[PDB]
Amino acid sequence: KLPPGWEKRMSRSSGRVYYFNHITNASQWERPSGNSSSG
């Protein structure tokens, strides 16, 4: 899971908004928390 280096990214081909780590280099679908996660 993401956040040191992240962005919420649209799939610029066909499907979904995904969520991204910059410096690992990993695409998932997660808003990582806020303050509490909960999910």
From Swiss-Prot:
It comes from Homo sapiens (Human). Its main location: nucleus. The WW domain is required for the interaction with STIL and KIF20B. It comes from the Eukaryota. Expressed in immune cells in the lung (at protein level). The modification Phosphoserine is found at S38. Residues 1-34 form the WW domain. GO terms for biological process: cellular response to hypoxia; negative regulation of amyloid-beta formation; negative regulation of cell motility; negative regulation of ERK1 and ERK2 cascade; negative regulation of protein binding; negative regulation of protein catabolic process; negative regulation of SMAD protein signal transduction; negative regulation of transforming growth factor beta receptor signaling pathway. It is found in: Nucleus; Nucleus speckle; Cytoplasm. Interacts with STIL. Interacts with KIF20B. Interacts with NEK6. Interacts (via WW domain) with PRKX. Interacts with BTK. Interacts (via PpiC domain) with DAPK1. Interacts with the phosphorylated form of RAF1. Interacts (via WW domain) with ATCAY; upon NGF stimulation. Interacts with PML (isoform PML-4). Interacts with BCL6. Interacts with FBXW7, disrupting FBXW7 dimerization and promoting FBXW7 autoubiquitination and degradation. Directly interacts with RBBP8/CtIP; this interaction depends upon RBBP8 phosphorylation. GO terms for molecular function: beta-catenin binding; cis-trans isomerase activity; cytoskeletal motor activity; GTPase activating protein binding; mitogen-activated protein kinase kinase binding; peptidyl-prolyl cis-trans isomerase activity; phosphoprotein binding; phosphoserine residue binding. One of its GO terms (cellular component) is midbody. Peptidyl-prolyl cis/trans isomerase (PPIase) that binds to and isomerizes specific phosphorylated Ser/Thr-Pro (pSer/Thr-Pro) motifs. By inducing conformational changes in a subset of phosphorylated proteins, acts as a molecular switch in multiple cellular processes. Displays a preference for acidic residues located N-terminally to the proline bond to be isomerized. Regulates mitosis presumably by interacting with NIMA and attenuating its mitosis-promoting activity. Down-regulates kinase activity of BTK. The chain holds residues 6 to 44 of 163 of the full protein. The keyword RNA-binding does not apply. Keywords: Acetylation, Cell cycle, Cytoplasm, Isomerase, Nucleus, Phosphoprotein, Rotamase. The gene is PIN1. This is Peptidyl-prolyl cis-trans isomerase NIMA-interacting 1. The keyword Acetylation applies.
